Structure 1
Amino acid sequence: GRRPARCYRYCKNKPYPKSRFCRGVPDAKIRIFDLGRKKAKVDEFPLCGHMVSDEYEQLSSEALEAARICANKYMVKSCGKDGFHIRVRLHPFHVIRINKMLQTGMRGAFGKPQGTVARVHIGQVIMSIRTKLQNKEHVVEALRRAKFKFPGRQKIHISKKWGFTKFNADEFEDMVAEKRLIPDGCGVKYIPNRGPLDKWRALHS
């Protein structure tokens, strides 16, 4: 139904968002970016692996949907439906056009919206998985399988940050002990030595 993904692999056009100028864009193939036990607290899943893009290219919303299912099914089978949390880190905002031929030719060749893609840079995280530290093997295998749904080269990388947080795993526990970090569900709020001293009193009372 759609052209082979080699036709829209490269970031050749400027970003083309669905806006008030580009009307008629069909809905993206991927509508869910978080799945698994999304409600696990920050402290339940210390491990985090990433699928990191090694190329500057465009991924179709179809391949994001395909990879998500691929990585999600393998985790449900090797860790259980409540043993992980998957977050797809790319959103298909750039719109790809089509100049449909059956005949004007190249006259009036500007194309109609055909789909959506995510523009991914080198070193940019495609999708992330957080789970328990004893499932590190199953995370790598899930992301290794999902690579086959994407064009180009992607690298797997087990992060040093605690879960989906921005704070290193080697010190995350210490910061929570002294109330520099406050769990707020999947993540942690950061407490600076700033602001009204009342907020400090509340945290220490």
Structure 2
Amino acid sequence: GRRPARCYRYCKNKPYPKSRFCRGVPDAKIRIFDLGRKKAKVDEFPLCGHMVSDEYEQLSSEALEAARICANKYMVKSCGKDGFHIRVRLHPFHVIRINKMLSTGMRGAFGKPQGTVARVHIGQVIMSIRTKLQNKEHVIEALRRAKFKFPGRQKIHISKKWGFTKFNADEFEDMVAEKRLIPDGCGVKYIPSRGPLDKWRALHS
């Protein structure tokens, strides 16, 4: 089976991604990174909550899967099966190796792929949930449960941005009225006041 996660907690090796030099990597435990209502329009889910790592460590693909399931399950219970959208912001790209010791020694010890981990930085966001403002308490509580599936310390931070966009919530509505933020599915498109005037014409037509 798997070694305990304590054996691969620290970013001890250079990144070792699945590439043409690293063949036979088993598929990561986590495959679905986005769940809930991914289609919900930018304006439907303004409130955003992030789980932020406070250590420079490795999070295994299995750990990412368990937290995703744990957060999803609770959010369905508290807000509904379509009252939010969860995105896992870490993709396990670092391949960890195992030198199988089956009853020779350390001769030729370079191991074989065992799994994948996501090298996380202090302050890198681990997972994000966007929902309505009235569900802030649940998003903290849901993210609180998912914290117990990870090693190390994590912090829950309610973002001042609007939804999953990179624009402040307190000014998001103003930019949309002034056509500097066109709703484009999940996110928005920023309209730079540059480029051919035809594009400005269509927007204001």
TM-score bracket, normalised by the shorter chain, equals over 0.9
Q: Counterparts in 2 of 1:1-205, with a 5 A limit?
A: 1-102=1-102, 104-205=104-205
Where 2:189 maps in the other structure, the secondary structure is strand
Offset from partner CA, 1:131-175 (integer Å, 9 cap, x none)? 000000000000000000000000000000000000000100000
Q: Which runs of 4+ in 1 moved over 2 A?
A: none
Q: Give 1:103 shift.
A: 6.0
Q: Give 1:102 shift.
A: 1.3
**Quick one: distance in 1 between partners of 2:38 and 2:193?**
30
**Quick one: distance in 2 between partners of 1:175 and 1:156?**
28
**Quick one: distance in 2 between partners of 1:103 and 1:148?**
36
Q: Give 1:104 shift.
A: 1.4
Q: How many residues align?
A: 205
Unaligned 5+ segments in structure 1 are none
Offset from partner CA, 1:89-110 (integer Å, 9 cap, x none)? 0000000000000161000000
Q: Give 1:188 shift.
A: 0.3
**Quick one: distance in 2 between partners of 1:174 and 1:69?**
36
**Quick one: distance in 2 between partners of 1:58 and 1:112?**
18
Q: Give 1:18 shift.
A: 0.1
**Quick one: distance in 1 between partners of 2:83 and 2:124?**
25
**Quick one: distance in 1 between partners of 2:62 and 2:202?**
48
Q: Give 1:82 shift.
A: 0.8
**Quick one: distance in 1 between partners of 2:170 and 2:32?**
31
Offset from partner CA, 1:41-89 (integer Å, 9 cap, x none)? 0000010000000000000000000000000000000000110000000
**Quick one: distance in 2 between partners of 1:69 and 1:147?**
12
Q: For the aligned residues, what is the CA RMSD?
A: 0.5
**Quick one: distance in 2 between partners of 1:181 and 1:39?**
18
**Quick one: distance in 1 between partners of 2:186 and 2:38?**
7
Where 2:134 maps in the other structure, the secondary structure is helix
| TM-score, normalization by structure 1 | 0.99
Where 2:39 maps in the other structure, the secondary structure is coil
Unaligned 5+ segments in structure 2 are none
Where 1:86 maps in the other structure, the secondary structure is strand
**Quick one: distance in 2 between partners of 1:151 and 1:100?**
24
